[PDB]
């Protein structure tokens, strides 16, 4: 499902933003 890839990574890379 590439939707959930990018949403995956979108979330993951908004999480580490946060720190």
Not at 1 to 19: C, Q, S
Request: glycine share 0%; no cysteine; hydrophobic share 40%.
């Amino acid at each position: 499902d590439e939707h959930e890839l990018l949403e995956t990574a979108a979330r993951w890379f908004y999480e580490i933003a946060k720190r």
